[model samples]
Target: GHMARTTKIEEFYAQFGKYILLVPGKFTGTVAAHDLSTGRTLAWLAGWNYGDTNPIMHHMAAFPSPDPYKGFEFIVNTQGGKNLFIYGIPTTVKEPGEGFNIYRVRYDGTKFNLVSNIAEKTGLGLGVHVTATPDGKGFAVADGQKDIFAEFDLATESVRTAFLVDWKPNNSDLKRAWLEGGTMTITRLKPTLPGGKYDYTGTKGCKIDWELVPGGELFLEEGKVTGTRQTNVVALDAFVYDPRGRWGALSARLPGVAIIFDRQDWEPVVALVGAKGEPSSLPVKKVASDTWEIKMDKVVTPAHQAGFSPDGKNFLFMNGVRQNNIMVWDTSNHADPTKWTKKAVVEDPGWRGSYPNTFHMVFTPDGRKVYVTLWWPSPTPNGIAVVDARNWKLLKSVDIGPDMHTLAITYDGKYVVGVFSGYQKTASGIVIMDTKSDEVVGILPSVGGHHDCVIVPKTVEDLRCSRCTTT
Candidate 1:
């Protein structure tokens, strides 16, 4: 119901930025905030109304209003660091707004609260996915289409370009590209730099002072930036990495470089996993000779998404590729081959479509409990619904109204958030649930270049005690 309330007036990237500029010197960090709702200026941290960078601020979220844009993804932060989520609103950033660059914001908890119109130095920020270490001290942003991935350090405030995951794609059978990446990276954090200024409000726009590090670049040594490994697979490698640092898993249609010359004109596919793009110790030929065989009967279907356990030690693969089936392998020992055990398939006994096309999984901090979401949960509602990880039992389905593309869990295992977004006309935003009562709390926007969602805090009181990972 986009019944234009009125024409968009003006903004942060174009005209309103000067009102709140806080840069102290040439290289010093700074920020400015322009309140969109009131046409007034607020301290950058008070409430950043991003005009060019964050159109969400310009458009107004309506809440329980009559019409909604249907975008609802949120920001997520881990212990000390942050996950800098960015979104490219092609329509919102043009004319009525400055059109070229992109928008950004961080999740300190309450809202993304604008970050900037562009990256600190890049002056351009339209990427698919960006992730922070659990401590939020550092992050990696990627432009999957361009094979570009960069790392940024918070303290020094510098961006280090990392190795490109040069894996290419053969086709987008589902019709849309950029749905997933050719390679996915997964790792944990070991916090850094306690204090000097302690600025939640930083030196620049309350942005902290940071520096480009010497050995910080993940993939550069010589002049050119290249992929750390050769392209072994040529399709979307579905990554199911548990944000809690518990485990990382990968799944895909597993397309081989070699194509068969038969009438089908296709190669077989088997859902497989490995440390993404990790340099193989053996020769290239030997490594390729390993990793795959006996491709699965199904291709990378629309129903499939992947995930891991709470200890970061197991590989739980969801294969919508084969009749909405699930396969969990004991990757606790990743070194040996053929050492995998398949969990019993969670079949729809009543034959209720027998295909869920799940996107992600949520887990209890201790790994004993788990939840999974579907793109469409027929009998109930089409949103981030539920499932049992322990015994593969079906739980109550959540009524989030529309699509459920991604899922996220609160640290204390009290609530679950799903990235209910992507494309227009489909209602999106995280569908929240109070784990204790399994009741729907509310939905929040994870749009504005926002791909995933995690919860943090605006004030210390909102933060859980020391065991914050699962309060």
Candidate 2:
């Protein structure tokens, strides 16, 4: 039991965040704070529209050590307007509404200040997506437009939600929601096929759910089958978590299936029955037309941005859109989560010239490599795609400048910002790469660029400590 170290790395560098918490989004909905060791811009909070109508800032969480909540910050504003159809094939901005807000910032290094807003009261409508609660107290939101799911208690700030039953969400809360230990795996979307049309079913299809004991109460052991109307789960996006939270790695974008759960009892290990011969029940079968058609001897079909590697052994999927193409799953046997094993599909060879549009994929605290992100926009080469998490190869294409969204890793882990989401208002902004010389040190422009980025940690001094249970 040798454990007496109280705190002192110069006070853990004075309680959290050398800085970096952008949200930028289309035109400038502000909320920044840069300095990850020296890119400056302490804090900024312009117009504050915060993104949803296409400026998407998915999951801006930050709070693992800011001396309790002194430096607060947990944004998930999503779903405001636009997006009647961007890739689902429609035209020009449509503008639908429901409600979405859940701020709570507070900077002090200069001034970012919002300090608790909260909406998304779960009328079973707008709420975006968020995730935390592993000890960070609480958090859990979802509902990009419907099929609800809420839960925030930080101590007592109170927020229940959880609408369950029937289920019918198309936007299905975009990102961030896979807290483990207590259990969670929301973001279900896969209904709308019969004449309703949205079918893309690439391989195993999707339409997921699982709450187990999710951070407390919360229900829904399952959903998504009932009527079976024209099935083929066309979306089912993010769900990574695996920094020892056991396992999780889902992403099914049109027929592509790349799952791997087992958060103790979340189950999805699909096939390792000792030698592959052990199928009596519990496989959750349904087999095509869409959604449940289990079989996981390692199939990485149409995939989406699935990640997990800073030692969770391995996992990295992307096949969607033209996102180059990658697939890595070795899972290091980690206590037999059905002995996961795919290990390598990697491709980016064409980068963006022949096929790669790739968008958001990370890992590299030493988990080998894999940066991804590229765009195919602003005149070619786009940006990242470092690859080689062991064998998938490719390894090199750090460009930096395009519509490249999502990417993070800097809490003293070196650096690899990359946001550029503004698409190209002169190349939008943000790009601090340098994970051991893949080059490009700092940029920070801020236009319509950033769509979520967090890294705040310096820790231990007076320690205000208030991770939010706010009333």
Candidate 3:
């Protein structure tokens, strides 16, 4: 059965050369190390076997050590949730209130060895995506449900600092803030009932009640309402650092804003919303070093996954769903947020349907082109939209497969690989395209629901080897 597949392997190696593809099986609870040259799975690390209750493995990052001879260390996050089974195999392990785990592993060319498993131990909640810090001494995590942006220090083996992106003064305590009408409450309790109703039923320690009049939730203390808090769920999705790691851009789903902050202070310099030439509630003001006040009514477009250009001079973010466009911003005045301007808005071609939602994006090494994965629901032949980075124009949409999600480019900038992951299990795999020709060269089979992929770098310089600076 596997013998015929060897032919494609020879062709793939001849075109792209040798590299190890580290892919996390979202629904399969495994992180597979694929040998691209020979088209073989070199190693597998299953989360279930390593004490993960619901290991829905999502994103991963390969951090190269300063000493190139030691190889690279890998960081993988599991989007843990209630236990469920797909095709007789368990996909999730944890309950509603419990958090997920982050795995630190090392690959010794032939196999993977576990270094550490941290979750509640480090007070992390609902891990979504992970990226290496510029110094390579720590990594940053975007906790989706928890609305948290965490930085983990490798030397200390603990979270250096975790900030609530939607923090309010009244909700001071970090642990209890989410329960008190933060993003977590909106995601976990608001839509728990039928017909998109709120679940007023309290959790373990608190009694919760929601009101439509004020448009917020009320926390009750012994049958009496202690506080009524407006639910502003800024669902923090992706936290990405710029090329030099001087600034970090965080994308929030609910508010549709990108919070650009200073890396040293971790204070948001500016909160950006709305597209180019779009009307926005202006005069963006700084409420404090940690906060910026923006009117929600003025937010014209919402962002999903954001990335910086290879040169760090341009910032691009995907506006998925109804907006269906990529918003580009000029980052010339990097230190001054007020000087940042909207460069362009590259709208989707809508080839497959009304909303060809854009997902993740990766730029070429030269920053001449950007490949954005198009996710048009399930069963639609989804693909990638190649955009001219210079002019911000949609060049073409190449249909690779269904449910195109995340993208990764090779160090040499020869091939761009995209993963197929969505509601359909049959559509789970990856499509490889030659950047020069902009054509799909090969499609490799993998376990169902492969979410994220990273090309392991061999040296420290290879860490910044991709088209995007910090892949």
Report the C-alpha lDDT of model 3 over 234-262, residue by residue, as the tens digit.
Answer: 55766677776678777766455677767
Off-target runs (Cα >4 Å) in candidate 2 are 1-20, 23-30, 42-237, 241-248, 251-284, 293-307, 311-330, 333-338, 341-364, 367-471
Between the candidate structures 2 and 3, which one is better when assessed by TM-score? 3
* Runs in model 3 lying further than 4 Å from the true structure: 1-8, 65-70, 83-99, 167-230, 274-276, 279-292, 348-354, 422-424, 459-471
Clashes of 1: 34
Which segments of model 1 are wrong by more than 4 Å? 1-126, 147-152, 157-161, 165-304, 321-323, 334-345, 349-355, 377-380, 419-423, 426-430, 437-451, 457-471
Best candidate per TM-score, number? 3
Count steric clashes of candidate 3: 3
Model 3 is weakest, by summed lDDT over 10 consecutive residues, at: 207-216
Q: Is candidate 1 or 3 superior in TM-score?
A: 3
TM-score of 2: 0.29
lDDT winner between candidates 1 and 2: 2
TM-score of each: 0.48, 0.29, 0.79
